[PDB]
Nucleic acid binder design. Structure first.
Ligand SMILES: [Mg+2]
Ligand SMILES: [Zn+2]
Ligand SMILES: [Zn+2]
Lengths: 177, 66, 263, 49, 133, 394, 147, 56, 113
RNA sequence: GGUGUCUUGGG
């Protein structure tokens, strides 16, 4: 009767929190253990994915605050066999930077991950010794506020390249046309 | 890099107020309560300290440039 | 006719209630307290030795901002108009700092308190760095490690704010008048109702709410204000205001004189 | 990259054909010429030994 | 120098599209078949339904750069509460007595109608208007 | 790309090294300020001076032999402004108007007579916007078959040079043919049509300043009730699509001429969903208040559109990759998330939400595909256009 | 971080800007006309979230595909005494006379971009020519010329 | 390559900026680009004066 | 680079006087003043003080372009008063108001302490 | 004061 339910119980999160097995225990041990498996470009044909682990159970109104998932109205008894980790992991390494990406029009995501990769900033913490043809250090960097859960991994907050200024969206004297 | 001199938008000296702030964190405070005790009422100042990341620790960590 | 009413006061913030004067007059006053009140600040760093990890012009930049006790600054001629050549001790106060984390272990916070006035046209209490308390280390100019000597000399001159953001005596002037819209100068955005969402200003009680049957006074004016001059400490807030007034007097005096000059 | 070259602007190899769910990135890619070709990896791309 | 005079009852006033200017539909009592439509500034002269107005139309308030007035000099306006200026911009001498006159007060309009013998002098270009009460 | 990308100018020497333009001339140059870069030649001797002075100085360039219409309209702000300024309910005190009559360069030096004299003098925007428009014009334009009374205050009648009534926007001073600018050009030659732009821009900017104007997040939000309507509309949409399939996949659909069963099936479903989105957008557009901003600009026509509001607030609809609906990349579905043979619009890409709620996953990926087509298109078709223009000219 | 790019047009000193009631000033004034045609609501939603993040004092979680509404943000905002849809009453700086409209206002995250005005500006009086043609030479760093 | 369209001189490139406080038929050159380029004016029996000025 | 000196905002030029007067030719009894190195801080104030006077008929300033530390004012009173004189009286009044203001603020500040 | 390729970019 585990059916429908995920296989990574809270046991596993606890262990991964300690960092050791309760008689090293990291990622590859997850995979080889039996709770995450790899799918490639093809096998991803013949499987079934729920978006977030909240859609395993047949989910059950009409308040205007959240977003509209499909309820799965085809099968009165479905058969999932895979469930995403978290779909904010479809973006690229230069696109998780966009904060609240999904409230946008894609041509803007595109200009983003084609401009953020030109930010003046602090690229490696040893500009003193490297002697390179260009480099550019911005004086006073600032980790920004609209962080994701991924700048917890791109070190972008220990190494930002941008600043926070008071933006006032209001035509003023026509110089900003 | 090292905490600035003036807050950017307003212009109330913020530099000094850095050390104490870390020290406040050392007791379990909250950034809100901390800032309030450091008496930063507007937010312009409150970002000039709530964001600021201090690099220069790395920039030193290289054994002497000399 | 014009009147004044402090409300809460200390040396840095002075929440006054200038009443019964125009709107432009309060605005002119505000621009004066932020621009044209002369102070005294670092203007020509002359590094003699750096072994920090920080660039040079960088520490130049920071020292260029430091608040300086400038209470007497208004008796010290302008940098471009002193009858001497480049700096003497008449129109400059010179400040030398030089620390050296000697000993091959640990960190040294080269604060601002370490700035020692060398000389200056005294004993006008000028040029010193400014202190919150007297155990107040102050600005955090640099960090040093082993053998990282730093040694720097500074000129300090007297400038206005149009020159730069460092002779900015006062920091952040608050302002507001007619908190209850009773002139209909604004036009509140709203979805469901106006009076709900726009939270009432910190000046609710100082004027009495509008009456429901009250018609629009088509003749009223903005007649009271509330402003709030802060300063980083470089001056004493009352000197702020007193000097804004003096400056503005002097400017209009200059203008009256110019008219008479054509005359 | 992909050396389909640019002799052949047949606009098929440039469109984000539908298996790129999670194997490359829909937000990132250059613009102008290399548009659509120069693909980037999904933050969980793993390439097999 | 009044080139008209009458007294009106306001039948309907619609704000609708504005917060300061409302349109009024006035009809006389001395004589119907003088229909009136006028826009007014609710903040400078509020009105309400089924009230009264004493309308007058001059072509010179005397009894070129407009300065604000002295206190000492005197007007025809000195007996009213809303003295607007405008231009005769349409004078459509139609049937026997459907004579509509359209005067525009700088975005403010005026549909005026009525007896030929009455309006016939309104073939001018400048019409003050002097609402009362 | 057309004989406006080169006009003369005149030089005024200003510090802080970039190029200064005026803002009437972003449109022929079709050059924004996202970093455009423009070459600036120089004459070198007398003949070609006089040639630029008498042939290609912008005043002689207002009317294009392309569509015998003006090309240099009025652009973003100054437009949205000169609408907000000449509603009906604009009133401008005496102080401010002394100024707003200094700014006009062409001005005579004679205040107007203020449309009100008592209780306390005011003025009305239309008069000022009439101070610019040089004496001696005429214009009549009629939308909606309005009267000479004009309840909703649209249309336009301008006599002798003093606006007489009417909300002024793109259709009149804009790039529209037979709009104002055109008329004054024909009626006065170029030089006056030049100083027109000067007058309108200085005025409406300075007034826009002392008014101010902005946008906020709220403007793109709707209340609860409009949300009830819009959700019900799209509800009925998906209901109809289920019915349409229950027909076709029961072998009941009637085939349009020339389209086989599937082409007709898709053509229908597309009519249905796009009509539904149209309904929703129409609801939200008719619903939002007046001083609300998005509606202020759209109605001023500076930027934006209807379909803008239909998406920022109401919905997005279906997504299109080369005409047809979203293909099946994988076998018998668009993703590994739905099963096989699920034509109902959520699968093949009925972007249901509106941005202000934020898309799901699948919808985000689809919408990214659509934008990708947009980019591919923008970066490819330009090649053929350059080629074609080259041939046609040679 | 949403393409709303563009460069500095002009510089105002500290007073001449607008400035709200408390004494804040603006820093960097985009032009609204950017927004309604670009359908980038993320930029507003961000600026809102930042205003909240500074006030309560913690970094706001903008993870996409999560459950953060626009309301819950709005409530948290108004609880701290601010208008729950971003706006604040602002002031003209040249005459103090209130700006008739209310203005959006916050801290938002920009990031400098390379293309500096001294990496494209240029000129050419005359100068170095090729030898194969005498036509003036190619490139910027060589007193080149234009095509 | 070089007889249809060729590189030429007395040009200048840059980034541009908008500024409503102008006329319509005016363009704003920074001071440097103005001191770099030049216009060849010929001296006449009217304008030796300004020209000597530019000399100085 | 090509930015003018950041002190070109207050230092009057050598032979360009502080304040140049030009008589307006359009309407009777009206003139122009070109200020230097001044801003709204002065113009706004002089204007409003001229906007309350009886005999002042029309007066206003504009600020040609912010890349230039100057502006211009235009003045016209009725047939009686030379505009010059009115401007002087306005100066006197603003000075006097401000002297009084200073006086009262000192007195008040010493009371509060 | 090279010149020739390729690469990455900007509008
Ligand atoms: Mg562009
Ligand atoms: Zn601050
Ligand atoms: Zn000296």
């Amino acid at each position: 009767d585990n059916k429908g339910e995920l296989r990574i119980t809270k046991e596993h999160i606890r262990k991964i929190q300690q960092g050791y097995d309760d008689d090293v225990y990291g990622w590859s041990s997850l995979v080889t253990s039996g709770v995450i498996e790899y799918v490639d470009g093809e096998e991803e044909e013949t499987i079934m994915i729920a978006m977030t682990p909240e859609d395993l159970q047949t989910r059950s109104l009409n308040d205007t605050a959240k977003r509209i998932k499909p309820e799965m109205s085809t099968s009165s008894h479905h058969t999932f066999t895979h469930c995403e980790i978290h779909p904010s992991m479809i973006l690229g390494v230069a696109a998780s930077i966009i904060p609240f990406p999904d409230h946008n029009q894609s041509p803007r995501n595109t200009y983003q991950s084609a401009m953020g990769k030109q930010a003046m900033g602090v690229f490696l913490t040893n500009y003193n010794v490297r002697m390179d043809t260009m480099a550019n250090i911005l004086y006073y960097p600032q980790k920004p506020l609209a962080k994701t859960q991924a700048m917890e991994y791109l070190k972008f907050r220990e190494l930002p390249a941008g600043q926070n200024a008071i933006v006032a969206i209001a035509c003023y004297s026509g110089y900003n046309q | 890099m090292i905490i600035p001199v003036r807050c950017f938008s307003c212009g109330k000296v913020v530099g000094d107020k850095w050390d104490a702030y870390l020290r406040l964190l050392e007791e379990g405070k909250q950034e809100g309560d901390a800032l309030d005790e450091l008496k930063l009422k507007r937010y312009c100042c409150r970002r000039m300290v709530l964001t600021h990341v201090d690099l220069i620790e790395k920039f030193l960590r290289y054994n002497p440039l000399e | 006719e014009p009147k004044v009413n402090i409300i809460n006061a200390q040396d840095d913030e002075v929440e006054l209630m200038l009443s019964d004067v125009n709107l432009s007059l309060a605005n002119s006053l505000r621009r004066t307290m932020l621009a044209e009140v002369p102070t005294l600040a670092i203007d020509l760093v002359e590094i003699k030795m750096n072994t920090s990890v920080l660039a040079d012009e960088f520490i130049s930049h920071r020292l260029g901002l430091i608040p300086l006790v400038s209470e007497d600054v208004e008796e010290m001629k302008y940098s471009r108009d002193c009858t001497c050549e480049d700096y003497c001790d008449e129109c400059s106060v010179v400040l030398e700092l030089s620390a050296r984390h000697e000993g091959e272990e640990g960190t040294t916070d080269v604060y601002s308190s370490s700035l020692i006035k060398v000389s200056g046209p005294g004993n006008l209490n000028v040029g010193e760095p400014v202190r919150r308390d007297d155990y107040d280390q102050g600005i955090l100019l640099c960090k040093l490690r082993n053998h990282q000597e730093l040694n720097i000399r500074c000129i300090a001159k007297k400038g206005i704010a149009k020159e730069h953001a460092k002779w900015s005596p006062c920091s952040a002037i608050a302002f507001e008048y007619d908190p209850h819209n009773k002139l209909k100068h604004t036009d509140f955005w709203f979805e469901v109702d106006a009076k709900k969402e726009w939270p009432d200003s910190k000046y609710a009680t100082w004027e009495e709410p509008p009456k429901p049957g009250e018609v629009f006074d088509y003749k009223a004016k903005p007649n009271r204000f509330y402003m709030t001059v802060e300063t980083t400490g470089s001056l004493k807030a009352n000197q702020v205001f007193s000097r804004g007034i003096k400056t503005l007097q002097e400017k209009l005096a200059n203008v009256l004189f110019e008219l008479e000059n054509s005359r | 990259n992909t050396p389909i070259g640019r002799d052949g602007k047949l606009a098929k190899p440039r469109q984000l054909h539908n298996t790129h769910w999670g194997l490359v990135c829909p937000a990132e890619t250059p613009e102008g010429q290399a548009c659509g070709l120069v693909k980037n990896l999904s933050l969980l791309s793993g390439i097999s030994i | 120098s009044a080139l008209f005079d009458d007294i009106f009852t306001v039948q309907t006033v619609d704000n609708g599209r504005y917060n300061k200017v409302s349109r009024i539909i006035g009809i006389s009592t001395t004589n119907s078949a003088i229909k009136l439509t006028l826009d007014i500034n609710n903040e400078m002269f509020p009105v309400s339904q089924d009230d009264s107005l004493t309308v007058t139309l001059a072509n010179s308030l005397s009894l070129k750069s407009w300065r604000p007035p002295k206190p000492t000099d005197k007007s025809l306006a000195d007996d009213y509460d809303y003295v607007m200026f405008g231009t005769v911009y349409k004078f459509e001498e139609g049937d026997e007595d459907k004579i509509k006159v359209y005067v525009s007060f700088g975005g403010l309009l005026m549909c005026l109608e009525g007896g030929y013998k009455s309006l016939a002098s309104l073939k001018q270009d400048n019409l003050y208007i002097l609402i009362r009460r | 790309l057309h004989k406006m990308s080169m006009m003369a100018h005149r030089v005024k020497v200003m510090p802080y090294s970039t190029f200064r333009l005026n803002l009437s001339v972003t449109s022929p140059y079709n050059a924004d300020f996202d970093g455009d870069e423009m070459n600036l030649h120089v004459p070198q001797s007398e003949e070609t001076r006089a040639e630029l002075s008498q042939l290609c100085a912008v005043p002689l360039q207002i009317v294009s032999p392309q569509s015998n219409k003006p090309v240099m309209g009025i652009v973003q702000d100054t437009l949205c402004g000169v609408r907000k300024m000449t509603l009906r309910d604009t009133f401008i005190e005496y102080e401010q108007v002394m100024n707003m009559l200094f700014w006009v360069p062409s001005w005579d030096g004679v205040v107007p007579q203020p449309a009100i004299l008592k209780p306390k003098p005011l003025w009305t925007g239309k008069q000022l916007l009439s101070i610019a428009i040089p004496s001696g014009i005429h214009l009549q334009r009629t939308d909606g078959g309005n009267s000479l009374l004009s309840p909703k205050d649209n249309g336009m009648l301008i006599v002798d040079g003093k606006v007489m009534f009417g909300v002024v926007d793109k259709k009149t001073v804009g790039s529209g043919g037979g709009g104002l600018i055109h008329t004054v050009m024909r009626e006065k030659g170029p030089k006056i049509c030049a100083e027109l732009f000067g007058n309108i821009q200085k005025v409406v900017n300075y007034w826009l300043l002392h008014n101010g104007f902005s946008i906020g997040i709220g403007d793109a939000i709707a209340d609860a009730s409009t949300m009830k309507e819009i959700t019900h509309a799209i509800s009925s949409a998906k209901e109809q699509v289920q019915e349409i399939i229950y027909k076709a996949q029961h072998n009941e659909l009637e085939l349009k001429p020339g389209m086989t069963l599937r082409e007709s099936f898709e053509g229908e479903v597309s009519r249905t969903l796009n009509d539904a989105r149209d309904s929703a957008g129409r609801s939200a557009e008719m619903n939002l208040k007046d001083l609300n901003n998005v509606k202020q600009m759209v109605s001023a026509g500076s930027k934006g559109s209807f379909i803008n509001i239909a998406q920022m607030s109401a919905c997005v609809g279906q997504q299109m990759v080369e005409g047809k609906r979203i293909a099946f990349g994988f076998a018998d579905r668009s993703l590994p998330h739905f099963t096989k043979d699920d034509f109902s619009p959520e699968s093949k890409g009925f972007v249901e939400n509106s941005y202000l709620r934020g898309l799901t996953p699948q919808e985000f990926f689809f919408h990214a595909m659509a934008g990708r087509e947009g980019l591919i298109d923008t970066a490819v078709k330009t090649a053929e256009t350059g080629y074609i223009q080259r041939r046609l000219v040679k | 971080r949403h393409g709303q790019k563009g460069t500095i047009g002009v510089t105002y000193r500290h007073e001449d800007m607008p400035f709200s009631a408390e004494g804040i000033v603006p820093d960097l004034i985009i032009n609204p006309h950017a927004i309604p045609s670009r359908m980038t609501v993320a930029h507003l939603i961000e600026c809102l979230l930042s205003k909240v993040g500074s006030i309560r004092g913690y970094e706001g979680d903008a993870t996409p595909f999560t459950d953060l509404t626009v309301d819950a943000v709005s409530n948290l905002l108004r609880d701290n005494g601010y208008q729950s849809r971003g706006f604040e009453v602002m002031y003209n700086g040249h005459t103090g006379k209130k700006l008739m409209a209310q203005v959006f206002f916050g801290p938002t995250y920009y990031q400098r971009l390379r293309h500096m005005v001294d990496d494209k500006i240029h000129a050419r009086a005359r100068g170095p020519v090729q030898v194969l043609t005498r036509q003036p030479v190619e490139g910027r760093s060589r007193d080149g010329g234009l095509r | 390559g070089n007889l249809m369209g060729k590189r030429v001189d007395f040009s200048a490139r840059t980034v541009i900026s908008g500024d409503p406080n102008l006329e319509l038929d005016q363009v704003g050159v920074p001071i440097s680009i103005a001191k770099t380029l030049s216009y060849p004016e010929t001296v006449t029996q009217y304008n030796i004066h300004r020209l000597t000025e530019y000399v100085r | 680079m090509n930015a003018p000196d950041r002190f070109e905002l207050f230092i009057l030029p050598d032979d360009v006087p502080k304040l140049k007067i030009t008589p307006d030719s359009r309407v009777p009894n009206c003139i122009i003043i070109k200020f230097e190195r001044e801003d709204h801080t002065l113009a706004n104030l002089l204007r409003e003080e001229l906007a309350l006077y009886p005999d002042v008929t029309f007066v206003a300033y504009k600020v040609e372009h912010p890349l230039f530390a100057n502006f211009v004012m235009r003045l016209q009173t009725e047939e009686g008063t030379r505009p010059k004189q009115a401007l002087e009286r306005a100066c006197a009044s603003i000075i006097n108001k401000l002297k009084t203001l200073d006086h009262k603020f000192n007195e008040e500040w010493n009371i509060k302490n």
